[PDB]
């Protein structure tokens, strides 16, 4: 039709951090439309893709992906924690991610 989306939008906020030490191994994601941990429990274990573009074609594509998954909820406001096979680059704080509906339980 006009929309072909099968993923929920999300935003890469930052790494897990204290006041003055961050941890790139874990990322904080805001899922569009999730406001509480109770809602954020639905997306636990779902796969996240970060989709970006590069100038150099690699394997028949100028588009590249970093694949991760939602591990747990974070705070009271629906923010979740995500882990990616390679850590997100930290210039993507504020950048969009795609949270897929697979693996699917409902």
């Amino acid at each position: 039709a006009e929309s072909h989306r099968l993923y929920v939008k999300g935003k890469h906020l930052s790494y897990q951090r204290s006041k003055r030490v961050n941890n790139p191994n874990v990322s904080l994601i805001k899922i569009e439309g999730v406001a509480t941990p109770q809602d954020a429990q639905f997306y636990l274990g779902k796969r996240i893709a970060y989709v970006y573009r590069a100038s150099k074609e690699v394997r028949g594509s100028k588009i590249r992906v970093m694949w991760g998954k939602v591990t747990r909820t974070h705070g009271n406001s629906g923010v979740v924690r995500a882990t990616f096979r390679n850590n997100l680059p930290a210039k993507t704080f504020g950048a969009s991610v795609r949270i897929f509906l697979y693996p699917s339980n409902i």
Binding site: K11, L13, K30, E32, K91, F93, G94, A95, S96
Partner: protein, 197 residues
């Protein structure tokens, strides 16, 4: 959900609006703030004028041109508040601040765009009834902002054209509502009503 979010700054509390926008910018949302001159600060006009004068007196002693710049315009007073809530010396903070535009009044192209409010930062909701508050336009004028009159004149001109647009929109909305009400009680409408629509 919008690509650009236009906030009408009228009747908002400057610091609570500032924190909201600073979080929005850092989270990657482009924000335009209009009618900066209609922003509110809680407290009397004298208190806030005294606070700006205290801000005015601090400057690099040996060269006043390398010191704390004291911007007078309301949009810049808002911008200064929003800086300091943004780590503005970093690349991430610069990229956040580049997602923001603050204007006096409503200029084009935002005249014909939806303006939102932030109820979290609205004075009418936050401030206790009877509490004295300041308007950023008269604060800015008292500390040296020059363009309150031109802003007011252009805003009156915009409000007149906008009221005329609204009169036409209201007439069409009336006609649309009448056609939709007439279509009700038909078969398709009753099936729709059984589905919450």
């Amino acid at each position: 959900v919008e690509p650009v979010v236009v906030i009408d700054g009228k009747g908002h509390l400057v610091g609570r609006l500032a924190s909201v926008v600073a979080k929005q910018l850092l989270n990657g949302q482009k924000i335009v703030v209009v009618r900066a001159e209609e922003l509110n600060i809680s407290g009397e006009f004298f208190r806030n004028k005294l606070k700006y004068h205290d801000f005015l007196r601090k400057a690099t002693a040996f060269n006043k041109t390398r010191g704390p710049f004291h911007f007078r315009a309301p949009s810049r007073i808002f911008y200064k508040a929003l800086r300091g809530m943004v780590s503005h010396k970093t690349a991430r903070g610069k990229a956040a601040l580049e997602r923001l535009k603050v204007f006096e009044g409503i200029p084009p192209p935002y005249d014909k765009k939806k303006r939102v409010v932030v109820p979290q930062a609205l004075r009418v909701l936050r401030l206790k009834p009877g509490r004295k508050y300041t308007t950023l336009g008269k604060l800015s004028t008292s500390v040296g902002w020059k363009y309150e009159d031109v802003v007011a004149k252009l805003e009156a001109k915009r409000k007149v054209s906008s009221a005329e647009y609204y009169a036409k929109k209201r007439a069409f909305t009336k006609k649309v509502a009448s056609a939709n009400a007439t279509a009700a009680e038909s078969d398709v409408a009753k099936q729709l009503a059984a589905l919450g629509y």
